[PDB]
Every structure is written in structure tokens, then in C-alpha cells.
């Protein structure tokens, strides 16, 4: 027919769910989570340094066995950094220094690299000729990559420059699933411990969850009021924290469809860059624009712990599956262990 | 002590000896990021120069290792990714000034020369402004005059009177004149004096930094 | 990945030879290489290794100051010069890669091996509780060998390797670090071990079982192997 009806269709549709929300929205969180005790003061102490990079380190991830973790810097050099005797594991060179993104294959075989590139090459670290080489080149998308992260041996999940997102096969190299619900850049993935639902933060201000296998969006969340940067899910696979420019962490709850909890302080003016949680996911660690990092608590909200032990601006925060110890890396080329 | 774990210390060693090599290399190489309004202006001086995403093209000249990256065909949010291009040497920024007269152009490429001189990212890499399709300008002159586009422009209808306003009205848009160091030469296509140029922009670039580096100058 | 050695045959008592290894298939760099002899009538014995980046060269105690060791990656070759050797050297030579890190497979691939035949303390040994033990198939046997001190490092990693020599094969790597099983070996191996007393057993052996296991220790350079047990089909 007309637009002005379907304008009003979609009007009245979030008048109907917005007041929804407040009518199922009975209390709030502090109320309830202020007979939980706070964890008070968290020192940490940096156990390991790498100094190996020679350009600004982008992003890291960790692996199954909590030990060998890749990391990505500017040079266009994937290094994979032994966490216990901090020795060079194996070196990769880059095709395009130009990357932003990385990630490591829960079973240990492959790995990912994207960035201002269109592709997000895989590389086998278990080859048997003992060098490293190209073993899938993702072809498909048009914009920069934001995130790679991988679903099992065959699947990995890409976020690209545009609003789409999409799902590679690597015995293929072809997009099983293409989602093109969100608005803005895709910034930020986050998958849930079940393997099943995994959420993506884009610059449309928004978080939108998405299912491995149908492909349709559950929920939207708009609790932000600018564009999103890192996301983290909770280990529990019910919740996650969404983190902006505008100095404030929004934890959403995926039962509640709601902002739980934010996290700000008036002092704290930057933005955020990195965000993820611990194994219990009572700690909720989060690197700024500034030199320092925060570490807050999950339940009162409170900074727990400040991280001073860098000079630039933080770029990853990789958390272990066991808990024992986290990454923190940042533009200055250093990346430090804290625990 | 350990038993295989001194292997792997010097197979570190030896990556780390790889990456050190490796970074040398690159520092002695010099990168350029290519930027401006327009895909024919960028891709003319692209061409005129060598030996999808981002296009990386490497070329040899007076012994230095020039790589341009153009990002011309991203198509996305600049804020968001621009910070990767802090340690770049210089930002080639070329236009053309047909736009002059083309559906509204000029002010586009103005703003966007406008928000790139005074990014927080590029507070120390200068600019190199390039004006393209010279012999169209000098021939649109003859036909239309130049206060189409601009109300306070107030002279004769000359090709070097014109350019020098352009010149100066691209110039004056910076704001960190005390900082940066605007380069404007006019290129159309023509024999290797735009590398030349280049070449020139880069060294003068280099020592500046040379200068800031050691000292105040 | 190819191992091609030459220069073997007669050599006279107090010579000099030069025996060639060409690698192909893998980065000859990267991977370090080793030397083992075996005896017509005994086991297999460590000679020299030589490093990826060619440090670090050490040499066994029968061996110290007689042979040297060099490679060539450029031209990617390996040259073991033997000179004024014993009559006691006459052996089959094997040249075996290498590789150091977290998760690594080393001695994984074994070269053919050259035949050279001579005219007319402080090591860990490994001794062996049985030299032939005879087996059946679908059966499973048990090989155990103990050492002169606990393998077991302060990493909690066990240095303790098991190869399988066919009758007219080169060795091959089945178990190494007593918790992985090498690429292409089935997984119906089992070796454990609490650092002095090892334990391997062999459920559903097959004919392709055929052969002699060698148990070796990495804990330090001078490597030793065992006895080698002979299985009877």
C-alpha cells in the first residue's frame, strides 16, 4: 500500500513492546543483589610480559587447554605466545599487515585472521610439512572484518564492515548463513558456551542474537545510545555485556530482554575497547581508552580493581576458560598476564 | 633447567631475530595512505605510479620503497577504523577540481579534506593535497566562472587567479598550520614530476620528524 | 616429506667419508635433524643431532670429536663427515626430524637409512625387562622397561618415546611423550607410566604389528635406546 502505514504498524509495535517490558519489570537488580556481599578490593599482580610484537597489538584469543594463545599486531605477524614460558610458538606472516581480529580454533588445528581486509584467512598450526600456509580464503564479503570466531572444525562466524554477518563452511568456502537484520557496522561477536545462539554488537547502538542453525533474530536490545565495541557472553549462556563509547557497560539479560545493570563513573569518560568476563562471571573486566583497565563487580557494580600496568590505549582482554589468569594487550606492542 | 624446553627458547630466539629483521625492513620502507573524493582522480595517479578492500601498491624509487594503501573501496564508518592509520608518513589527498562545477562536489571533498586535517589520529602524519584534471579546470574557466560555487570569490576569471584561491581555500581550512604542512601541486597526466613531488613531500616529512624527534629541531 | 641418504658400502678402517642426506616435502630449517645407528645384532643408538639454526651441536660419548655434523639450506642438504672410524662403526644410519615446541610430534619421520660396513658412564639407561615376547592376533602383550631415574620433569611432562621397526621398513614413532599418539598411528595404543615403571599394551593387534619397539628417554642429549623387543607373529 503506503509507507505511512507501515510506519505507524512498526510505531505502535514498539509502543506495545516497550510497555510490555515495564509492566513485566517489577524490580530492579540493585534491590535484589544488595543482600550479596561485595568482593571489596581485587589486587592483581602482572605475572608475564611479551615484548615480542613491534607494532600495536589488535586482538588475542585463548585456547582450549588454557596455555598456547594467539595474538595479531600491525606488522602483519600472527605469534602464537606460550603463557607459561613465554616462548614464540610459531610465527605467520601476513598477506595484509592491515588486521584487526584473530581467533583459535577450540580443537587447536586452525586459525583465523581478518582486519581491513576482506578475508578472513584460516592458517593450520598442525601441518605436517612443519610451515605454516593458507588453508581457507573467505572471498565473499565487500567491508572490512571485524570478528572471526569459529563454531566447530568446518563452521566459523564472520563479522563484516557492512550490516550482514556471515557463516563460512571451510570444507566449502561458502556462506551457509548470510544475516542482514542489523543496521549498522558489525563490531563485536560473542558466542554462548552451548554453541547454539551467539549475539554480534554493531555501531547501530544495538545487540541483536542470532541462532547458529536457523538464522532468524530472537531479540533486540537498544539500551545504548552509541555504537558498540567489544561484547562478551556470559558463561552461564543466559546473558552478556555490551560495551560503547559512551563510558558505560550494559549488561543484558537474554530471559529478562532487558538492561540489567550499567556500569559507568563520572571520572571514567572514554570509551570501550575490550570486554569479557571471568570463568564465574562475577568479575567483569573492561579495557578503556586510557592507559589503565577497570575490573568491576558483576552484582554491586563497584570497581574492584584498577589495572595501571599499561601505557596506551587497551585493545585485548582475553579470559581463560579456566579462570586462572587473563591477557590484557593494548596498542604499546606489550601483552601482559594478570591474575 | 629443562630437557626439550632449551630448543624451544632458541626457536624463540630465532622467530624474535625473524620479527626484529622483518620490522627493520618495514621501517626502512615508507607507507602512504591515499584518500580524497572521487574514484578517477585516485585512479589516475594510482596509475600513474606502479611498477576489493584495500588496494596495497609497492614501488621502487630513488631507492626508497613507496607503499600507497587506498581505501577508497571500503564503503563504510571512517571513525571506526581510521586509528590504523596512525603511523602512516603522509596522507595523499587528491581531488579534482572539475567538481567545481558538477552537482555540490567541491564542498563534500572540502569537508571531508576538513575533518581528515583535523583528526585526532593524524596529529602528527602531514598531507599532501593533489589537484587533478588541471586542462579541464583551465578549460571549464573559459566557460563558466568560478563564483558558481563560491558567493565570496570576487575577480577576474583567470586559471592561475583560480587556482591560487582554490589553493588558498583548501589551505586555510587547517587548523594546525603551527603542526602540519600542506603540500599542493597541480597533477594531470603528464611525465614523472608527481613522484618526484612525492619523493620530496616524503623526505621533507622524514626530517621533520627527524627534527621533532631528536630535539626541537 | 622425503628422506633420500647416500654414501654408504665398504669403507676401509681409518678413513674418511662423507655421508649426504637430502630432505624434501618440509621446511629443512625449521626442523632439526638426528643420526641414529642400529647394529646388524643390536638396537638402534644415538650418534650426533645438529639444531634448526645449527647451534648448539652435540655429540654421544663414543662419538665426541670424531664425526662432525653440518647442513646446508640453501641447498638444503645434510653432510655427515666421519673420519679415522673404529671398526666398530659398521651400521645402518638413519636421519631423523625434528621439532621443539608445545604440542610437537619430534622424531615423527625416519629416513631409509645407509648400510656402512668396515673392512677387516653418565647416561640414562634403559633397561628392558624382556627381548622377545611372542604374540597372537587379537591378542594384547604388555611391554615394560624401566630407567635409571624418574623421567617425570618438574613440567609434569614424561620424555619417553616408543618406535616400531618393521622387518625391511624404517622405524616409525608411535607414542611420544607417553600422552600422544603420533599422525597416521591408530589409536588402539596405549602406553602410561608413572616416571620409572612404563606400561604399553597393544589392544587387537594386527598383522601390520610385525616388528621391534624401541623404547627411548629424552631427559638429556646423550639419548639411549633400549634392547628392542621382537615380536613373533
Known amino acids: 500500500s503506503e509507507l505511512d502505514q507501515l510506519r505507524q504498524e512498526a510505531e505502535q509495535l514498539k509502543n506495545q513492546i516497550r510497555d510490555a517490558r515495564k509492566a513485566c519489570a517489577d524490580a530492579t537488580l540493585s534491590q535484589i543483589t544488595n543482600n550479596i556481599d561485595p568482593v571489596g578490593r581485587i589486587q592483581m599482580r602482572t605475572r608475564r610480559t611479551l615484548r615480542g610484537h613491534l607494532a600495536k597489538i589488535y586482538a588475542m584469543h585463548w585456547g582450549t587447554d588454557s596455555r598456547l594463545l594467539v595474538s595479531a599486531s600491525q606488522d602483519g605477524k600472527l605469534i602464537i605466545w606460550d603463557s607459561y614460558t613465554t616462548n614464540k610458538v610459531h610465527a605467520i606472516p601476513l598477506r595484509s599487515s592491515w588486521v584487526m581480529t584473530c581467533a583459535y580454533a577450540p580443537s587447536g588445528n586452525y586459525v583465523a585472521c581478518g582486519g581491513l581486509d576482506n578475508i578472513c584467512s584460516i592458517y593450520n598450526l598442525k601441518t605436517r610439512e612443519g610451515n605454516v600456509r593458507v588453508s581457507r580464503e573467505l572471498a565473499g564479503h565487500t567491508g572490512y572484518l571485524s570478528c572471526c570466531r569459529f563454531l566447530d572444525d568446518n563452521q566459523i562466524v564472520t563479522s563484516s564492515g557492512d550490516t550482514t554477518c556471515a557463516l563460512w563452511d571451510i570444507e566449502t568456502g561458502q556462506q551457509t548463513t548470510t544475516f542482514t537484520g542489523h543496521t549498522g557496522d558489525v563490531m563485536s561477536l560473542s558466542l554462548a558456551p552451548d554453541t547454539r545462539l551467539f549475539v554480534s554488537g554493531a555501531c547501530d547502538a544495538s545487540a541483536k542474537l542470532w541462532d547458529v542453525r536457523e538464522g532468524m533474530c530472537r531479540q533486540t536490545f537498544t539500551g545504548h545510545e552509541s555504537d558498540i565495541n567489544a561484547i562478551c557472553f556470559f558463561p552461564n549462556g543466559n546473558a552478556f555485556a555490551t560495551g560503547s563509547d559512551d563510558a558505560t557497560c550494559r549488561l543484558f539479560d537474554l530471559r529478562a530482554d532487558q538492561e540489567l545493570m550499567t556500569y559507568s563513573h563520572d571520572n571514567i569518560i572514554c570509551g570501550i575497547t575490550s570486554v569479557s568476563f571471568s570463568k564465574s562471571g562475577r568479575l567483569l573486566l573492561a579495557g578503556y581508552d586510557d592507559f589503565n583497565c577497570n575490573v568491576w563487580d558483576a552484582l554491586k557494580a563497584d570497581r574492584a580493581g584498577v589495572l595501571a600496568g599499561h601505557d596506551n590505549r587497551v585493545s585485548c582482554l582475553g579470559v581463560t576458560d579456566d579462570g586462572m589468569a587473563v591477557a590484557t594487550g593494548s596498542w604499546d606492542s606489550f601483552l601482559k598476564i594478570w591474575n | 633447567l629443562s630437557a626439550e624446553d632449551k630448543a624451544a627458547v632458541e626457536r624463540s630466539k630465532m622467530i624474535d631475530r625473524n620479527l626484529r629483521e622483518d620490522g627493520e625492513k618495514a621501517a626502512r620502507e615508507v607507507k602512504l595512505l591515499l584518500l580524497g573524493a572521487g574514484e578517477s582522480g585516485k585512479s589516475t595517479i594510482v596509475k600513474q605510479m606502479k611498477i576489493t578492500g584495500i588496494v596495497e601498491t609497492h614501488f621502487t624509487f630513488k631507492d626508497l620503497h613507496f607503499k600507497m594503501f587506498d581505501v577508497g573501496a571500503q564503503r563504510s564508518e571512517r571513525k571506526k577504523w581510521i586509528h590504523c592509520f596512525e603511523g602512516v608518513t603522509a596522507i595523499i589527498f587528491c581531488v579534482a577540481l572539475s567538481d567545481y562545477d558538477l552537482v555540490n562536489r567541491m564542498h563534500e571533498s572540502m569537508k571531508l579534506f576538513d575533518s581528515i586535517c583535523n583528526n585526532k589520529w593524524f596529529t602528527d602524519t602531514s598531507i599532501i593535497l593533489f589537484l587533478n584534471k588541471k586542462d579541464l579546470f583551465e578549460e571549464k574557466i573559459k566557460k563558466s566562472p568560478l563564483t558558481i560555487c563560491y558567493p565570496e570569490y570576487a575577480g577576474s576569471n583567470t586559471y592561475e587567479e583560480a587556482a591560487a584561491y582554490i589553493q588558498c581555500q583548501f589551505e586555510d581550512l587547517n587548523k594546525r598550520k603551527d603542526t602540519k604542512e600542506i603540500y599542493t601541486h597541480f597533477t594531470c597526466s603528464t611525465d614523472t614530476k608527481n613522484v618526484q613531488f612525492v619523493f620530496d613531500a616524503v623526505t621533507d616529512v622524514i626530517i621533520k620528524n627527524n627534527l621533532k624527534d631528536c630535539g626541537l629541531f | 616429506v622425503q628422506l633420500v641418504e647416500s654414501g654408504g658400502g665398504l669403507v676401509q678402517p681409518g678413513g674418511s667419508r662423507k655421508l649426504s642426506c637430502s630432505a624434501s616435502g618440509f621446511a629443512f630449517s625449521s626442523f632439526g635433524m638426528h643420526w641414529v645407528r642400529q647394529a646388524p645384532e643390536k638396537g638402534l643408538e644415538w650418534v650426533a643431532y645438529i639444531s634448526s639454526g645449527s647451534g648448539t651441536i652435540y655429540y654421544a660419548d663414543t662419538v665426541k670429536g670424531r664425526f662432525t655434523i653440518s647442513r646446508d639450506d640453501p641447498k638444503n642438504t645434510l653432510f655427515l663427515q666421519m673420519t679415522s672410524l673404529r671398526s666398530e662403526d659398521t651400521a645402518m644410519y638413519y636421519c631423523?626430524?625434528?621439532?621443539?615446541?608445545?604440542?610437537?610430534?619430534?622424531?615423527?619421520?625416519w629416513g631409509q637409512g645407509t648400510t656402512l660396513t668396515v673392512s677387516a658412564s653418565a647416561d640414562i639407561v634403559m633397561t628392558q625387562a624382556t627381548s622377545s615376547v611372542p604374540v597372537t592376533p587379537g591378542e594384547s602383550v604388555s611391554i615394560s622397561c624401566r630407567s635409571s631415574k624418574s623421567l617425570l620433569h618438574s613440567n609434569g611432562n614424561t620424555y619417553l618415546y616408543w618406535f616400531l621397526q618393521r622387518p625391511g621398513q624404517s622405524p616409525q614413532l608411535l607414542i611420544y611423550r607417553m600422552s600422544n599418539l603420533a599422525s597416521g598411528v591408530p589409536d588402539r595404543f596405549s602406553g602410561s607410566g608413572s616416571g620409572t615403571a612404563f606400561t604399553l599394551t597393544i589392544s587387537r593387534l594386527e598383522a601390520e604389528d610385525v616388528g621391534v619397539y624401541y623404547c627411548?628417554?629424552?631427559?638429556?642429549?646423550?639419548?639411549?635406546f633400549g634392547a628392542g623387543t621382537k615380536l613373533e607373529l
Open positions: 631423523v626430524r625434528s621439532i621443539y615446541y608445545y604440542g610437537s610430534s619430534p622424531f615423527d619421520f
Open positions: 627411548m628417554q629424552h631427559l638429556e642429549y646423550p639419548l639411549t
